[PDB]
């Protein structure tokens, strides 16, 4: 049991931590471009 299942605890955690960063790459990449959305509208706000 410690060879068959223990070849799988290697490969259950492997997929379940690739999928968790993909929640955090949605959030840490547009809150840098929302400041770009602030400044690009701010160029006409100068005008």
């Amino acid at each position: 049991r410690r060879t068959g299942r223990s070849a799988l605890a290697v490969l259950i955690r492997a997929c379940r931590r690739i999928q968790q960063q993909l929640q955090r790459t949605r959030r840490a990449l547009f809150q840098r471009s929302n400041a770009v959305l602030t400044s690009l509208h701010h160029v006409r706000m100068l005008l």
């Binding site: 959305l37 602030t38 400044s39 509208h41 701010h42 006409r44 706000m45 100068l46 005008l47």
Partner: protein, 70 residues
Amino acid sequence: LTEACAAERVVRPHQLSPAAQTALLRRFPALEGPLRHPRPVLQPFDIAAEVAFVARIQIACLRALGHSIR
């Protein structure tokens, strides 16, 4: 002052909403100058506000010249 005028799409913050004015004034208190002064000698919220400060003096002397020559 950008995002309160960018999310509200207020192109010039003298067209800012009266609650949207004072809520920013409740946040940052040094903005009573460029929002609540009757005739500030420096123009509020313009890029050439220092340049338009100069061009008046260029104008106001020429009338002081031009009506004195007459």
